[PDB]
Structures are given as structure tokens and as C-alpha cells.
């Protein structure tokens with residue numbers, strides 16, 4: 001059968017790993033490929049070098065029907081090599097299964113490779129701490145069978161359903177935290193169930209690439225030479241990480257901008273509660289969707305070096321360019337960082353958190369369970385004095 005590789009991800013981390021897989025296989029210029037990476041654009045100077053390369057929009061975390069137009073161009077027997085975001089795997093594969101239904105004679109699923117979205121998978125797993133995980137797996141497997149037979153989605157445990165694909169297809173899972181699955185006691189049944197179908201995320205794959213493939217990869221992920229040089233000075237580095245807000249209200253976005261500037265000052269100013277000392281070069285890493293929030297920092301701070309905000313932070317993990325220290329507002333990007341590199345992580349007030357909620361939320365709990373952070377490194381945003 002002819003193999004078609006599908007790279008699907010609405011987010012960042014899976015895409016980063018999928019673009020590594022493409023780079024590792026980039027000598028094959030005609031292997032059929034379909035890219036559905038909402039946050040990444042393959043430069044046309046690379047697209048033109050490949051044949052049978054296709055692109056599909058994602059909408060509501062699934063490929064659009066435009067996928068069918070692509071697959072119709074391959075009228076023989078086809079086996080699908082599918083790369084997915086774990087958290088969104090059920091929706092991402094939905095149009096693929098629908099197409100297979102219409103072409104059961106010639107379309108088969110060869111294998112799945114699944115990659116963590118980031119913190120969201122582990123948080124979601126925390127909320128299942130009190131469940132009979134062994135029973136949830138069996139039910140999820142049963143309901144995955146119904147999905148595969150009817151095309152209709154109904155999971156009593158949508159979270160555990162993300163981890164039962166091996167009951168249907170050859171699968172390999174790539175986890176940001178293998179420790180979590182091995183340390184969390186309530187997850188022991190799941191760890192044993194997954195058996196030899198998971199592995200730790202290949203963060204050091206970039207180091208095994210060829211010199212030219214390394215440059216290939218950096219072009220795919222938007223990390224140009226100028227930014228690289230900046231993060232290679234022989235100086236103690238601290239990177240301040242920013243955040244964003246859904247709200248459109250100018251007013252509110254302005255408050256988030258003013259408050260993130262204040263948080264920066266708590267790290268970098270001597271009177272600050274989070275002062276890291278005088279011996280660090282300071283970088284700012286805005287949130288990709290920060291918009292004016294990011295401009296507020298650069299326009300009103302000083303002695304800071306900007307790292308373009310649309311770069312996914314996790315690139316620095318995939319490339320070995322992490323700083324000595326990272327600090328800022330809680331983000332998925334922290335789940336993937338070494339413990340000794342964390343200064344302080346700050347939390348924003350919302351529905352569940354109106355105080356340093358005794359750290360009774362899953363995010364901190366996961367991090368503490370894994371030992372990435374201690375209580376002294378958790379900060380509630382509103383408790384910080386206005387400097």
C-alpha cells in the first residue's frame with residue numbers, strides 16, 4: 001500500500017515534534033504528506049522542493065472536508081501514518097475515520113503517533129485522581145469501538161479515552177512527563193496498560209540532526225539566526241514569560257499589560273519581592289496572542305532583549321537554547337522545563353483561583369507531584385505590590 005503521512009496539530013508542541021519527523025525524513029521529496037498545523041507555515045522555498053505535499057485547514061480541532069479532496073487524489077490503496085495531538089486526538093481523527101468509512105476498500109490506518117499538547121493533558125488527568133482508572137480504560141475501549149464502527153463520539157471519560165488508541169491501531173505516545181505516569185499512584189493501571197506504547201518526548205532529536213537539517217528545522221519553526229545569536233551570549237540569562245487574555249475589552253487588556261509590567265519589575269528591580277539579583281541579562285518572551293500586551297512591555301520596560309512572541313517557547317527545549325532562569329505567568333511551557341531553571345511561576349485570578357488557592361488546583365499539584373516546583377515558587381498575581 002502507499003503510505004500517506006498526516007501531520008495534524010492545532011497547537012504548538014505536537015507540531016514541533018511533527019516538524020522534526022518531517023525534517024528527519026526530508027530527503028524523501030515525493031512521500032505524500034498532508035500538513036494540518038495551524039500555528040506553523042512551511043516556507044514556500046521549502047514547499048517547492050517537494051512533490052505530493054498538501055496542506056489542510058483545521059477548524060474546531062479537526063481537518064476540514066478539504067481533506068477529502070486531497071485524499072481523492074490518491075485512488076489506490078492507501079495506508080495512513082497519522083501524527084496527532086493527544087488532547088484533541090478524538091476530534092482530529094474524526095474526518096479521517098469518516099473518509100475511511102466511504103472507502104473501506106482501499107483506506108486503512110497504518111499507525112498513530114500522538115504527542116502531548118502540554119500541561120493540559122496532565123491537568124486533565126489530575127481531575128481523574130478519584131476514579132477507578134482500570135474501569136475507565138475498559139469503558140473507554142468499548143466506547144472507542146462504537147466510535148470506530150458508527151462514526152459517533154460518546155465517551156464517559158473523554159480524558160482516559162485519549163489513551164486507549166492501542167485497542168484499535170498501532171500507536172506510539174510521546175509524553176512530556178513520563179514521570180507523572182510512573183509516579184501518580186491512581187494512574188498505575190494506565191501505566192501498565194500503555195505497556196511499551198509510550199516514550200518520553202524526543203527533546204534531543206535536534207542534536208542528532210545533520211548540520212543542514214538543523215538549519216532546515218529552525219526555518220520550519222520560525223527561529224532565525226538573529227534570535228539564536230541573542231540566546232547564545234556568554235552571560236547569565238533570565239527569560240520573563242508573558243501571558244494573554246481572551247477578553248477583547250481594551251480596558252481589560254490594558255490592565256493585563258500594566259500588571260505584567262509590574263510583575264516584570266518584581267523580578268528585575270531590587271525592591272521587588274521576586275528579585276533575582278544584578279547578574280542576569282533579561283529577555284522578554286511575550287505570549288503569541290499578547291498583541292498590544294507584548295508591545296506594552298517592550299515600550300515601557302528597559303534593559304530587556306525581546307524574543308519574537310510568535311515563536312513557540314518550547315522550541316528552546318527542542319533546540320537546547322534554554323536560559324539559566326525562567327520566570328513569569330503560569331503557562332504550558334513550564335511543564336517542560338528543568339527544575340533548576342525555574343525562578344518563580346505566577347498565577348492569575350479566575351474562577352477557581354481567588355487566592356494562592358492553597359495550591360488546590362491541578363496545575364500546581366502536578367508540578368509539585370513531579371517536584372518541578374515547591375510551594376515557595378508559587379505566586380498569586382494579586383498578592384504582588386504595585387511598584
Ligand SMILES: Nc1ccn([C@@H]2O[C@H](COP(=O)(O)O)[C@@H](O)[C@H]2O)c(=O)n1
Nearest residue numbers: 012241242285286287311312313331332
Ligand atoms: N510566553 C509565552 C506563553 C505561551 N507561549 C506558547 O503558547 C502556548 C500556550 O501557552 P499557555 O499555557 O500560556 O496558553 C505555549 O505552549 C507556548 O507554545 C509562548 O511561546 N510564550
